[PDB]
Amino acid sequence: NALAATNRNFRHASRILGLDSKIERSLMIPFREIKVECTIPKDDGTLVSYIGFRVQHDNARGPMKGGIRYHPEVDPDEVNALAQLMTWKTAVADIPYGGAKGGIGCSPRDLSLSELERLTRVFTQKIHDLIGIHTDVPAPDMGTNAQTMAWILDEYSKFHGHSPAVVTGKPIDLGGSLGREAATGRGVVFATEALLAEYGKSIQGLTFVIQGFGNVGTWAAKLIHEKGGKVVAVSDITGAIRNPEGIDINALIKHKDATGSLNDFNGGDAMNSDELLIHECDVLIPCALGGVLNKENAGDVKAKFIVEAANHPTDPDADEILSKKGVIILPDIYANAGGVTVSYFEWVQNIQGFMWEEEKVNLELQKYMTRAFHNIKTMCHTHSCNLRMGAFTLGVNRVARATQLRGWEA
Amino acid sequence: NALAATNRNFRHASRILGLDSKIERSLMIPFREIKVECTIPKDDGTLVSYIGFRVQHDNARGPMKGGIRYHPEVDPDEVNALAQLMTWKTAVADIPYGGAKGGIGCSPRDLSLSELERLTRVFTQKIHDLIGIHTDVPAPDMGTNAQTMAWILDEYSKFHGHSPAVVTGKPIDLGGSLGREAATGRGVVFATEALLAEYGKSIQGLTFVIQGFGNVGTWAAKLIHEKGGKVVAVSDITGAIRNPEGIDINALIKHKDATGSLNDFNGGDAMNSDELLIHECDVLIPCALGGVLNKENAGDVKAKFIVEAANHPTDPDADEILSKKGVIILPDIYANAGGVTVSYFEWVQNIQGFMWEEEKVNLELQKYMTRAFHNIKTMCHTHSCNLRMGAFTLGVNRVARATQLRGWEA
Amino acid sequence: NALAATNRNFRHASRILGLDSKIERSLMIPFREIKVECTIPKDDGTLVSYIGFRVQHDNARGPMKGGIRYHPEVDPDEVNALAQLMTWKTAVADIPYGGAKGGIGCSPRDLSLSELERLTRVFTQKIHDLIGIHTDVPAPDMGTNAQTMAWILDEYSKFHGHSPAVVTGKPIDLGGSLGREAATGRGVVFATEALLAEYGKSIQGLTFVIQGFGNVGTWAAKLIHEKGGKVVAVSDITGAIRNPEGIDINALIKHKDATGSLNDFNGGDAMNSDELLIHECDVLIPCALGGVLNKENAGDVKAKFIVEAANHPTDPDADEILSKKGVIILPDIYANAGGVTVSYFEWVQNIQGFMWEEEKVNLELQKYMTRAFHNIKTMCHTHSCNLRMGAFTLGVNRVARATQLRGWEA
Amino acid sequence: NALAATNRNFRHASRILGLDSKIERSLMIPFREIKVECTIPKDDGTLVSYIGFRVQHDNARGPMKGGIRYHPEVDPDEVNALAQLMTWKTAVADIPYGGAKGGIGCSPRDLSLSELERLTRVFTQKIHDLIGIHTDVPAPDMGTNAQTMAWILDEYSKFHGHSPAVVTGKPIDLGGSLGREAATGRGVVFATEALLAEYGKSIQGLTFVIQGFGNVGTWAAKLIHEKGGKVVAVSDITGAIRNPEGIDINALIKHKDATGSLNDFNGGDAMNSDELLIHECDVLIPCALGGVLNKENAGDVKAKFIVEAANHPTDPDADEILSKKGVIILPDIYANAGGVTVSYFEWVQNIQGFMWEEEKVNLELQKYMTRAFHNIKTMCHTHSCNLRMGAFTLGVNRVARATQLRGWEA
Numbered sequence A, B, C, D: 001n002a003l004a005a006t007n008r009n010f011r012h013a014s015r016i017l018g019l020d021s022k023i024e025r026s027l028m029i030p031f032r033e034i035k036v037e038c039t040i041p042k043d044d045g046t047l048v049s050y051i052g053f054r055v056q057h058d059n060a061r062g063p064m065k066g067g068i069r070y071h072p073e074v075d076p077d078e079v080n081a082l083a084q085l086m087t088w089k090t091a092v093a094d095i096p097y098g099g100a101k102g103g104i105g106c107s108p109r110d111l112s113l114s115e116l117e118r119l120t121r122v123f124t125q126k127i128h129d130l131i132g133i134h135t136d137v138p139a140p141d142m143g144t145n146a147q148t149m150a151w152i153l154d155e156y157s158k159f160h161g162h163s164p165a166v167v168t169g170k171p172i173d174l175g176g177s178l179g180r181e182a183a184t185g186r187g188v189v190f191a192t193e194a195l196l197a198e199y200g201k202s203i204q205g206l207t208f209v210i211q212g213f214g215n216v217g218t219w220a221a222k223l224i225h226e227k228g229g230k231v232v233a234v235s236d237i238t239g240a241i242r243n244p245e246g247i248d249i250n251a252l253i254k255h256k257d258a259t260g261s262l263n264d265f266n267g268g269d270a271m272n273s274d275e276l277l278i279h280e281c282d283v284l285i286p287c288a289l290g291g292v293l294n295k296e297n298a299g300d301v302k303a304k305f306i307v308e309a310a311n312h313p314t315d316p317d318a319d320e321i322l323s324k325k326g327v328i329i330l331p332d333i334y335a336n337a338g339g340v341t342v343s344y345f346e347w348v349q350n351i352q353g354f355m356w357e358e359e360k361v362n363l364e365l366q367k368y369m370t371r372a373f374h375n376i377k378t379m380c381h382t383h384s385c386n387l388r389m390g391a392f393t394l395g396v397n398r399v400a401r402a403t404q405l406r407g408w409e410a
């Protein structure tokens, strides 16, 4: 379901642009795919063998960027789709990168710390000559954290000398960047502000309904409340609360710290966990799950702006229903692009050898998001479509233009 | 059918040797697999994209060796099986190599000469950092000839300087080896001589029935007739002849040069093309097709020695029927190993910078084949099996021993 | 004629500085010269062979910088002179570069696009190990444009990995720099402003006569008119106009867009194309051809400041006549140095991995030009000469000082 | 005069072979040419600058081979001609090499030992990345000896690690080869024996007239006398002797050791130094100077076989006069090829890491010379020409065949 959205959108964007068939066929085939065998001895002494993989889609615009995934179940079609999506997303945000995706087919909940370190180091030894500073830059993903990036950096340094810029997401004392934890919420807030200012409104004095308190949800809620807006509904995996005149987010954060839930809050009454999506509001921000909007919920919603901060929260039929209603949906390919931009900033800081302060990071992030939205709006106006197809058209056009400009060996 | 024989034989050989399960699992997983995209402009100007692949099984004993195939239809299971078979075959012949297999999914009958050269050069540019003199040595295969090796050598030299030993099968004036065309027939004759001398007989004064006149068939027939034997039946794709007192091979070769068939020969009468497999003879040598022996033909044959110079000419049920009859079958994993041995000799000559004469090549080939047969006979006597399982046991034992000796990262 | 000016100026500058003869002899001999053969198949199939060349003068101060020229007629003396001139010019502008010059002896008007791409790629393959990021950075020249730099970048990346900083002048979406088109006019305006402010005057309220509308001429005219000056005479290859109270440049630019000439303009009357060089004016700026000032015109001119924005517009006898008259001539070695400075900025941006905005580029350009003029004025005051010999003395002194500081192998 | 012979012979050989014009044009242009500046401080402290050069003609058959020359006067045309001649000569002898030639424009009679070492080391540092084991192998020439090769080896080893095979002609204890001093005389004797055995005669019982006692002359005379022939006339720079029944060479060698001349010998009477070229003899061997045969001497000679052991001893008109007379001339491109063959053997021994004995060297040299003569005779019979054009045709054909086989980038 998540792999068909990307390729359907690509076909539609290619139809809009009138691309040549040969160029589209060339944009289907990935630049390279690799499978290697990783065999380690356990703590007992016995051997265990896994299979590691790496897919690299395009490099027409610069180095390749992508995450390393530690999950037992893998599928080549899903991995190819994810690599292609990373390519388009990087093209949209206008950072000089490509797309990639890799991982190991193992379950990290069964291995101790030492075995996990051995597995990471062996994987790095096997793929050391296919990554690099200007070739391919791994990043952490699910099943992976900053410690794994530290181990990868250590092994690659053993091979090619001290290269701090080969990975992103490192700890702070190994060359990490400030402002990583709040990047996605900052990006969502900046995108929402730009979208609102397009129509002449502003964040100050509007109504927001936020679904979830992951990092994205809590940071977006805190930033919105600081800006001057009022939030009237909050969800979670366990519980949901409402307040018609605004919820004190600063109090709610410390309430969740101790209680661990949203039950028995002070400034708000509990509500059913299936109705907040239909509340009266100005902006609706889903941040937890994808596909939560479908045919049944499509007719009932009465929001005026939807910001897709999650991964694929909207189905196509619901999208057409909402288009006929008259609401505006910001695509997820652009809304949650704060993380990749901050990773690019960290890569730049490591290349330069000099670290920035947090203010510089935030200003650069704001500038990049605003410029991206202006470009997407112009491209949407040129071809007379909606925002999603504007984004995909812009990305595909950039990549195709670079590919044809670079050359075809005569 | 051809991919199940190799893995069934591996399972049986592992059962005989009592190998650990972990080591067998490690011997299943290939060392590396690669897919790349090769896009070229045609003579008109339009673009065409193909997908090239390369599988590298093991390198526990030295560099990797394998062929490049230009065939429209590909299958990962078949390619993996072929790479594994090359690994075992190299282990049997006792040359310091591993196993690999690669190719391009295109039909060379539709491309002109210039387009074919462009395709080869682009493929080499894409896989240049994964092959080498002591890493992986490509060889020609079906759809490929010596000119392709010349082009590969040229491009790799552009990248890494003059490296004549990166490929085998080059033309004679680019660093090729003498005695390449007659290698397989020489090997078959040497193996047959060793097998006969095992039981006390000799080639001089026996009866041979040879199926086919490819290079292998004609060279084996000529060498056998020179040695002192008599051949009494000859086949082809079109026609088959017989002579109870021996056929003049030296005359038959020039007869086929002009007529182009075996019809209306002087010293021999025509025969049905489905009965020669049941002729009275001492040695039967199939050289054209595989699977030609099955249940129907198994009971009728009355030969005393079968030499499998082709690829998989015997089915398992036929093999057991023949074992109960009491005949001896030389496995094809060992009989047709002349080509790889001569390729190894060419690699050695290019490493040394000094070319050998033909006599030295022939003496070395004879020594290697005799030593291989003595080793296979000893290993067959140790475990009380037949010749085929002796060969496979010897190969698997060598590879496993090297792998465990090399180390497991503690 | 253009090759004797540079070496005569070098001899005079060496005489002024009192340089050792050994050091001068060492500064004559170029660091390296290379000739290679470039053979390609045409679209028909037939072969064509050309000869490519590259001269690298000095590298005492950093990497080497120079242009690639596609012209049928070549001469080693001219190429050596151009490389030496680039060395001195880079030394004057105070950017850490050296000097070089290369090209191919072919006529690009006879080759199609595909053949031209093949020629560029083959040339790059032949000289790939003699250029680099910190070794030698090619730039476009006449017969060459940004597409050729894209092809060179592609081939060099195939060899040494992604290296965007190996060439300058790339397209914008491949890593180009903003503000390239207006660099030379900006530089001329900044130099003129500094020269005027030396004597206490200012651009606001003076009279300018500009010869030509190439990029340099139109940009200088537009910037001068914006600053507050008035232009009273304009030339072209076809036509010339005059207006005693100032010409609306903003209107003239759009007039030339449609009409394609300067005839029948609104705010100005046509004039003879051989008299504007003798108009009453404060500043005279030739921007089209060289050598336009000679003995006949030397006595007639009545300007107070001459800014040589073209290549060698003044002859020596005319220079001495003008010196006796009492006018001031800004040398061309310094006036048109905007292009190399902006190319250096692009190289820096590609090294850092982060692109600048246009304002930063313009501020840095202004700072560099002002500092260069102050240095040249100080050096001119030290030795009691004019501006041209001050420039050449400064450049030669910098290069000699670096060479002697670096060492002579004891 | 010496540069026109080679190119005239090339034109004639191309006319005989019917070569394409494009291929001939491609065979004119050298692969690469390099000029560098070599500046050293003298023993006093003052600086001296020279210009070093290196020309590399072709590498279609393997590494490049050529000599380093220390002579004050240089000429690009002469150097190009010498490189081309080395290419053809290597092609004739059938060793896998190309052609090159380099040197320094200095007079070694004015520099002390330390300054000469400094010059050699600086030259090596400047051209270190353009030579190598499989790229280009320098050799000593006039103005150069084995000590210079030792210094070059030392510097190149400092750069790229211990590489004993980068130069040939090293001292014996640094990896030199046995049998170097007598290589050319051995080669001349072997060639003469093959030429005589072509017509049915033999060396035993013939008459020889040898002009000169350089290394070639003395070694050829000693070997011929040992074989069973009789020498009846000997020349030198100072003096000439004759004996109708044979001269004791073993006594003459020790006579020259003490006296230092050929005057007052025991077994032979003095003769005029301008008549021995017209003596009655079977074989005439000039070994000292070139061009000694011309129109005046052409009609007077009465020999039956001429072996050109020197460099260009025969003029074209004299050649046609001698052809009409009916004598046979062995070309110098083949007669004196012993040195390059022994240098190739030394290169092979250094590549292998194991030194040969003298007997193996002599046997290999004999085999190579005999095979070369048989090939030249066959090629001469095919096209119905004389021996010289047979040699040049064979060389050009080999080089062109390799070039077209290697490829043209489609």
Ligand SMILES: [Ca+2]
Pocket: A026, A027, A028, A029, A030, A031, A057, A058, B037
């Ligand atoms: Ca692609």
Ligand SMILES: [Ca+2]
Pocket: A037, B026, B027, B028, B029, B030, B031, B057, B058
């Ligand atoms: Ca394995």
Ligand SMILES: [Ca+2]
Pocket: C026, C027, C028, C029, C030, C031, C057, C058, D037
């Ligand atoms: Ca110099």
Ligand SMILES: [Ca+2]
Pocket: C037, D026, D027, D028, D029, D030, D031, D057, D058
């Ligand atoms: Ca050439």
